[PDB]
């Protein structure tokens, strides 16, 4: 199935995924188009931050879903 990721510039990219695909894998696919390493990536969907150990089916992320890609601003 195809899902969407809204990147840093607001540009939308497409991803070909399966419900059994894990979040780390998804971040790897995002990395293929944008180049951002998965360890730096954060994905927000439906108001919740996605966990790398979980899969798309676990979060019930179906076709035409839009994921929000964000990074980090660290502070102390």
């Amino acid at each position: 199935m195809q899902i969407f990721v809204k990147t840093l510039t607001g540009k939308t990219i497409t991803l070909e995924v399966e419900p059994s695909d894990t979040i780390e894998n998804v971040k790897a696919k995002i990395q293929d188009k944008e180049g951002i390493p998965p360890d730096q990536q954060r994905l927000i969907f439906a108001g919740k931050q996605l966990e790398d150990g979980r899969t798309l089916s676990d979060y019930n992320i179906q076709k035409e879903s839009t994921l929000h890609l964000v990074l980090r601003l660290r502070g102390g």
Partner: protein, 609 residues
């Protein structure tokens, strides 16, 4: 850009269109019709009206949708535009490809043609338009040709329509920019930017002199434009949705239109009040072609989303215009038959078999690995059939599937092509009487696809692919590199091309035979209550049940047979808080244990009883 090997599961000959017609082109001299298919094949028909089968021939070089076709040089010389990003020139009489222009970078959506000046232009999602002299392409002389590619600049958005006037003095483009752009093809100079439309323009038409222009857009309106007045002169709202196809008579007074609402209408541009409902097609209209033998036109040819092409008679307009909405035709005078299109498909958990549903609602069972049909289940409930044929096994994805031709096209990529390693007996390949090895599906399939290629010398040893199976080699992003039939791998010039296009990642395995290793998996193992630090080295190729017997050897602190006895009472390697069958593969546990709301590292339960 990486390269992907793909193939089509089909018959030797696909006589009828398998996914509908995008564009039509009629030859009045020889009374021949040309249909451009979404199945990537152009077909020739005889419209004599009296023949049981009008099928003449089919032209198959394209690997994707054929968006437009143009019949030039006073009789027969077909030019085609395709979603494979290429433009192809064809000897229309003998029916073969001559040259392929790979100038376009994206789908090629439309073509315009200047009969007189014998000129032709091509545009697509490139946002670039290319002018070509038909005579220069058809040439076989090449006497200092130094082909100069002449492009047209200006288009901000993706072009969906193109039109050129007879004399070839004006050229206009339609796009998602809603605005139409005009130029002078002889000078390449920008003429104007006609603003007016609400949506995308999918059909453009120009008058003989190119003085006035007709346009159809997804906004539901037909717009008449004067290039003299340099602005719109009229707007006709005829359809209750997008208008995608237009044809005009020679008088340029009566406009023929159709689109989504499936209704076909003829409209008097002079007096818009006069509006005759020609017909209501069984699917949205994609393209139309008039019969110009007589004026007014006796019939109209209609291409839709369906594979069936129809002809509707327009002979009786005159009698209905004077007297007295009710449509003119109910049934077509002539029907070009269409095939079925596969619209739904399902890969079973064994990644070897495929279930499909088509436009006639026929369900069919397929074997990807042996590239063939196996059974026709008929109009059975597809989702129910899918459930019924469920196998509780896991096999990694090793191929992709596309249905944009209305036929099954399987595609292999460098990444996951080699990933599915299954036992032969499991794969139904019994080898009496030695043992069962762990075979790679993508490997075997690659070997079978290039079975006749001499560089790989034999076959794969297990199965054969249909010799007529087309084998396509192409860039993932778009551009097609080389298409040949399997059996043709033999030809010396063919083998020479395979040598030049086939990428390295395939060469490693088919010719050099350097078969890939596996990509191991591991999981935590400990007692669920008591016993007397890290996951052991393991593989999906392992029978999983045999690993539970190794756990019994630690309790002890010809032996291979004694370890099997431990399975009858001890071992008990349960997982995900449930009993685990010994016949189940280690890979299948990932589809049930970690898949059930848990991290990809679930510990294996263990107990003395």
């Amino acid at each position: 850009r990486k390269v992907q090997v793909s193939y089509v599961i089909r018959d030797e000959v696909e006589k009828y269109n398998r996914n509908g017609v995008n564009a039509l082109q009629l030859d009045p001299a020889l009374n021949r019709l040309f249909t451009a298919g979404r199945d990537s094949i152009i077909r020739i028909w005889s419209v004599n009206q009296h023949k049981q089968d009008p099928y003449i021939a089919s032209m198959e070089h394209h690997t994707d949708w054929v968006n437009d076709i143009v019949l030039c040089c006073n009789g027969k010389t077909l030019i085609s535009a395709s979603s494979d990003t290429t433009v192809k020139v064809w000897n229309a009489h003998k029916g073969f490809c001559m040259s392929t222009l790979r100038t376009h970078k994206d789908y090629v959506k439309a073509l315009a043609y200047a009969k007189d000046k014998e000129l032709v232009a091509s545009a697509g999602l490139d946002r670039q338009i290319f002018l070509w002299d038909v005579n220069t392409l058809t040439a076989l002389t090449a006497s200092n040709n130094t082909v100069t590619t002449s492009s047209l600049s200006g288009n901000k958005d993706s072009i969906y329509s193109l039109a050129m006037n007879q004399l070839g003095t004006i050229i206009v483009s339609g796009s998602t920019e809603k605005v139409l752009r005009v130029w002078d093809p002889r000078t390449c100079a920008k003429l104007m930017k006609l603003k007016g439309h609400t949506d995308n323009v999918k059909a453009l038409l120009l008058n003989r002199d190119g003085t006035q222009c007709l346009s159809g857009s997804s906004d539901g309106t037909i717009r008449l434009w004067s290039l003299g007045q340099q602005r719109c002169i009229a707007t006709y709202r005829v359809h209750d949705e997008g208008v995608w196809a237009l044809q005009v008579n020679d008088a340029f007074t009566h406009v023929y239109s159709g689109g989504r609402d499936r209704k076909i209408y003829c409209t008097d541009l002079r007096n818009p009040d006069i509006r005759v409902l020609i017909c209501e097609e069984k699917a949205p209209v994609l393209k139309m072609e008039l019969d110009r033998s007589a004026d007014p036109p006796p019939a109209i040819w209609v291409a839709t989303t369906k594979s069936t092409v129809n002809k509707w008679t327009l002979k009786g307009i005159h009698n209905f215009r004077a007297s007295g909405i009710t449509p003119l035709c109910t049934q077509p005078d002539q029907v070009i038959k269409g095939g079925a299109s596969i619209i739904q498909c399902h890969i079973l958990n064994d990644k070897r078999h495929i279930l499909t549903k088509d436009t006639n609602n026929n369900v069919a069972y397929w074997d990807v690995l042996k590239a063939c049909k196996v059974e026709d289940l008929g109009k059975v409930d597809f989702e129910d059939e899918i459930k019924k044929r469920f196998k509780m096994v896991y096999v990694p994805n090793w191929f992709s599937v596309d249905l944009k031709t209305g036929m099954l096209t399987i595609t292999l990529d460098e990444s996951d092509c080699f990933a599915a390693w299954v036992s032969a007996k499991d794969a139904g390949f019994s080898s009496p009487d030695g043992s069962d090895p762990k075979l790679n599906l993508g490997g075997l399939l690659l070997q079978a696809l290039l079975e006749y290629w001499p560089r790989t010398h034999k076959g794969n040893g297990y199965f054969q692919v249909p010799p007529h199976t087309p084998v396509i080699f192409g860039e993932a992003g778009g551009r097609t590199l080389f298409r040949l039939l399997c059996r043709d791998s033999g030809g010396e010039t063919e083998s020479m091309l395979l040598n030049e296009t086939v990428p390295q990642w395939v060469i490693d395995i088919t010719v050099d035979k350097n078969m890939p290793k596996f990509x191991x998996x591991x999981x935590x193992x400990x007692x669920x209550x008591x016993x007397x630090x890290x996951x052991x080295x393991x593989x999906x190729x392992x029978x999983x049940x045999x690993x539970x017997x190794x756990x019994x050897x630690x309790x002890x602190x010809x032996x291979x047979x004694x370890x099997x006895x431990x399975x009858x009472x001890x071992x008990x390697x349960x997982x995900x808080x449930x009993x685990x069958x010994x016949x189940x593969x280690x890979x299948x546990x990932x589809x049930x244990x970690x898949x059930x709301x848990x991290x990809x590292x679930x510990x294996x339960x263990x107990x003395x009883x």
